[PDB]
């Protein structure tokens, strides 16, 4: 925090490697998920069953 530095070893900061790009391993299939079918159902059941 000052512009004068005394004599010794001063533990400033540490580092880690920056990424290069984003890699996405999706499942390679096109499909609409069945939440369109489950929520739009005519028959629902009673709560104990």
């Amino acid at each position: 925090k000052s512009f004068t530095v005394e004599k010794g070893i001063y533990q400033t900061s540490n580092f880690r490697v920056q990424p290069t790009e984003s890699i996405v391993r999706f499942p390679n299939i096109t499909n609409l998920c069945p939440f369109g079918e489950v929520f739009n159902a005519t028959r629902f059941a009673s709560v104990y069953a």
Binding site: Q11, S13, N14, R16, V17
Partner: protein, 429 residues
């Protein structure tokens, strides 16, 4: 009871090298606050810099603990800048120092007693290179301690390494072999063992002529006591259990600090990815502000606990600096200070994040009862000896010191007049 006409003086001793195993230092944890609190993330680091100068003072406090352990390491081991190197093993009077000098066979400078002590204290693979250096990818999975990558425990090696702690303690050894206490007082000198060990019996009141008769006996008791320490360290963990409790307290706090990495503290997960996704956040960011805030207070409780522990390590390590300065570089007159019993010398055989002072102590073992006299009424005056209380076999009076039994002849020169016979109650003709 406290007998008026009888006196008991001890007449035999044991050279019991009492091992007072002491924590001079600790694991030199200098954790980055962004690595424990954030891992590799930086939105967390902006949340941590909203508190400003906590982790500046927390990292500066652990930095002062690590620099303080370097100061403890330098006030204990680096007392002198007159290093005597490791000598050829000759003319030591039979005192077998083969386990405490460094070995020539093994490529490191650690000693066979240090080959006992560096091999039973498990560090549980705590370091910098073991989990961080080779691990760009998956290297050495199912380790004994895990996920220090998300902890960032920069465990610094000590500035004096174990071969260079062995170099300093071998210099402090060869100072004690052929120097007195004079090697710590600037210019270092040379003096052999009958006079040097005669000087170290002389400071606690033992007369130095006992050693010249009993040099073989003190040498055999001392090397058999080193053999009993070596067999006890080969057999039981009860001696090293003080620093084993220190390393288990430290590593228990470290993998406990990993269990506070695991814990929720009221949150839904140990990860921060639940809000860091593409919805608009005028109010949604405030959720993981409090959820990360539940995780933030674990480190200050840790470094408060480790700072009261570092004050305890600093008290025992200023005690250890006082023990090198007054037991190795001198001889302490303080009662029950350098281990139990009257101190003779001490040897600093090293340890993982600790030092094992081998306090050679003079402990008496056998006790005998004798009669006594207050003074001798020789020619109408009260006669007194120079140093010591009176003992007697019943007809012949002798004078001895309080840690060993020696008989002294009643002469003209050893008696001085410091009073008359009538003012002294119960004087003996």
């Amino acid at each position: 009871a406290c007998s008026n006409n009888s006196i008991a003086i001890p007449t035999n001793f044991t050279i019991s090298v009492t091992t007072e195993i002491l924590p001079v230092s600790m694991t030199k944890t200098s954790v980055d606050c962004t690595m424990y609190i954030c891992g590799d993330s930086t939105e967390c680091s902006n949340l941590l810099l909203q508190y400003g100068s906590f982790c500046t003072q927390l990292n500066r406090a652990l930095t002062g603990i690590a620099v303080e352990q370097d100061k403890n390491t330098q006030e204990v081991f680096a007392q002198v800048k007159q290093i005597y190197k490791t000598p050829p093993i000759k003319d030591f009077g039979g005192f077998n120092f083969s386990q405490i000098l460094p070995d020539p066979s093994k490529p490191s400078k650690r000693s066979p007693i240090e080959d006992l002590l560096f091999n039973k204290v498990t560090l549980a693979d705590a370091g910098f290179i073991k989990q961080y250096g080779d691990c760009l990818g998956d290297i050495a999975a199912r380790d004994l301690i895990c996920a220090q990558k998300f902890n960032g425990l920069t465990v610094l090696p000590p500035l004096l390494t174990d071969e260079m702690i062995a170099q300093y303690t071998s210099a402090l050894l060869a100072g004690t072999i052929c120097s007195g206490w004079t090697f710590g007082a600037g210019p270092a000198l040379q003096i052999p063992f009958p006079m040097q060990m005669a000087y170290r019996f002389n400071g606690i009141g033992v007369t130095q002529n006992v050693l010249y008769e009993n040099q073989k006996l003190i040498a055999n008791q001392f090397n058999s006591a080193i053999g009993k320490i070596q067999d006890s360290l080969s057999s039981t963990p009860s001696a090293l259990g003080k620093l084993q409790d220190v390393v288990n307290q430290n590593a228990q706090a470290l993998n406990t600090l990993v269990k506070q990495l695991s814990s929720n503290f009221g949150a839904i997960s140990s990860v921060l990815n639940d809000i860091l996704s593409r919805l608009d956040k005028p109010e949604a960011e405030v959720q993981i502000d409090r959820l990360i805030t539940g995780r933030l207070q674990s480190l200050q409780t840790y470094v408060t606990q480790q700072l009261i522990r570092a004050a305890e390590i600093r008290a025992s390590a200023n005690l250890a600096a006082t023990k090198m300065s007054e037991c190795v570089l001198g001889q302490s007159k303080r009662v029950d200070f350098c281990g139990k019993g009257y101190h003779l010398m001490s040897f600093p055989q090293s340890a993982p994040h600790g030092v094992v002072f081998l306090h050679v102590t003079y402990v008496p073992a056998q006790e005998k009862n004798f009669t006594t006299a207050p003074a001798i009424c020789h020619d109408g005056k009260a006669h007194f000896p120079r140093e010591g209380v009176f003992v007697s076999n019943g007809t012949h009076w002798f004078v001895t010191q309080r840690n060993f039994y020696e008989p002294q002849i009643i002469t003209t020169d050893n008696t001085f007049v410091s009073g008359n016979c009538d003012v002294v109650i119960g004087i003996v003709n």
